[PDB]
Amino acid sequence: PPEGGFGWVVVFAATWCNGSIFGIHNSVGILYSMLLEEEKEKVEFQAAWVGALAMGMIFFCSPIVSIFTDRLGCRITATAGAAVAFIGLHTSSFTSSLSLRYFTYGILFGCGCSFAFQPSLVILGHYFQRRLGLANGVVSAGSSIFSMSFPFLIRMLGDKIKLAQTFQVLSTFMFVLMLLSLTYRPLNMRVFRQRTYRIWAFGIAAAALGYFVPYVHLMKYVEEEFSEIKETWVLLVCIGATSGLGRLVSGHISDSIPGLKKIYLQVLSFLLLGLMSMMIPLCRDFGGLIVVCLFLGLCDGFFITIMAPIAFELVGPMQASQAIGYLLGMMALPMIAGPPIAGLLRNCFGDYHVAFYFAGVPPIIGAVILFFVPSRLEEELRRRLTE
Amino acid sequence: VQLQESGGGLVQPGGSLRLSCTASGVTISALNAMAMGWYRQAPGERRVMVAAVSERGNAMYRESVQGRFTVTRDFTNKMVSLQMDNLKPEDTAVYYCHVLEDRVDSFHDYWGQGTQVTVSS
Numbered sequence: 001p002p003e004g005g006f007g008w009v010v011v012f013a014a015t016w017c018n019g020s021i022f023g024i025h026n027s028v029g030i031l032y033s034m035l036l037e038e039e040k041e042k043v044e045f046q047a048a049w050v051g052a053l054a055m056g057m058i059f060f061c062s063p064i065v066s067i068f069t070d071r072l073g074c075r076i077t078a079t080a081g082a083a084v085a086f087i088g089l090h091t092s093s094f095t096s097s098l099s100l101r102y103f104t105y106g107i108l109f110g111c112g113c114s115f116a117f118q119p120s121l122v123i124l125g126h127y128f129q130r131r132l133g134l135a136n137g138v139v140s141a142g143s144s145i146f147s148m149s150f151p152f153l154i155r156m157l158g159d160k161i162k163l164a165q166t167f168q169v170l171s172t173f174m175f176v177l178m179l180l181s182l183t184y185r186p187l188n189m190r191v192f193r194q195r196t197y198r199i200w201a202f203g204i205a206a207a208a209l210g211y212f213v214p215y216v217h218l219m220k221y222v223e224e225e226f227s228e229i230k231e232t233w234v235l236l237v238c239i240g241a242t243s244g245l246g247r248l249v250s251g252h253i254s255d256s257i258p259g260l261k262k263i264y265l266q267v268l269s270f271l272l273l274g275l276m277s278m279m280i281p282l283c284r285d286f287g288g289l290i291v292v293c294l295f296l297g298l299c300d301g302f303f304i305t306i307m308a309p310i311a312f313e314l315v316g317p318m319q320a321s322q323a324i325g326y327l328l329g330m331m332a333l334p335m336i337a338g339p340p341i342a343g344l345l346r347n348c349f350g351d352y353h354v355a356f357y358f359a360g361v362p363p364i365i366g367a368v369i370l371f372f373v374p375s376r377l378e379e380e381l382r383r384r385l386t387e
Numbered sequence: 388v389q390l391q392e393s394g395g396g397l398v399q400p401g402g403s404l405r406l407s408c409t410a411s412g413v414t415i416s417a418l419n420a421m422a423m424g425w426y427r428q429a430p431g432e433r434r435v436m437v438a439a440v441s442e443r444g445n446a447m448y449r450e451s452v453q454g455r456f457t458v459t460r461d462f463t464n465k466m467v468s469l470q471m472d473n474l475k476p477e478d479t480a481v482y483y484c485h486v487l488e489d490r491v492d493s494f495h496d497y498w499g500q501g502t503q504v505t506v507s508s
Binding site: 376382385 | 420439489
């Protein structure tokens, strides 16, 4: 491939796509939570369910999306999905009857994001081979910037318009993504038979259970009997900025580690993520707690950004789409079941110091799993046993 | 690059044997990213691997010999060592020392002349 030149506009499209998708998926939930803080709940336990249904629909639909990207092209899918998402976000403006809004926001939106998101990762590989880590790092950092700036963006520019009407504004971003999707240009379970890939997929899936809880459920602890001077917004924005920096750095470092050896980064990040969370209840000293949270933000980059390059390395470019699709398919149920499990474990034990103790087992187990991923040379050695 | 011939031995049942080989012309840097081991060819049997040691230092074994024969990398001397214990009459075979190289297209192979190993029945 060109490995440069024109390939720097595709990064712009991918950054825009990821930023818009996740910015909407977080801002809509946050804004409805604010509205519920301002308005009555009359449905109550289902209204908060939307923010999880729509998110989970993205990952739970990827397995089928991978048979449209690989069967039509990285452009047509990435534009039709954006069009569907635009239509979904447009009709949501009407009266918010439970079932009607439920459908219009969980089956039109979210489902369209699944079509408009998986192609945003495949195409980059088709433009970078030796620098792909750098491109992925840049894209992840830009998407983090976009997400962290989006809810504030719509809030400030929203002009304090009512939620039902403000759904129309978000519709424009999907249309722009549809137009920007024009920039993309092309330059079954068979994949599971590769043991070296299936074991890695299992290792990633196991650590999902312990990734969402500490990364999202964190503020409850400082809201629960510990914090006296909270200013937690500072903590959250610090974690976001450090996650951006970590993603940017991890993108480049993978450029250095040759070939399959990259996976050792994932092991060293999973182990430290697991250990750190276990130290959050113990390192109560607010300065130390802030430092540990800062570390948590940095550890994020190695977790997510470096997954796509390793996926390309393991199976090459011709099967990157299917492998990534079936990897994202397995992270839906483990990821979406974590927060409820922690929030009911706090009830089982009655104090909110144990959720974190549960938050460190899944990722350490996953790290133990990844450490045994066979080397290509060793896998060949076993292959030499065929005779 | 070639592995010098070595090995062999006639032993009684239950006996032990020690073997090794030498790598000629290989640099220590070139030795890394490669694995070394041994192969077996019993009467009427095709040349099949016995047990080797990977680049990471661990060893993969064949079903019929795992837990019976042991080897080590000996990377320091650019050599390889093989040892045996509790040999039995059916263990007789011609053992060939082989070295596999890491190569992007396909792993490259070196192997010297093996020697006959027989256990008296």
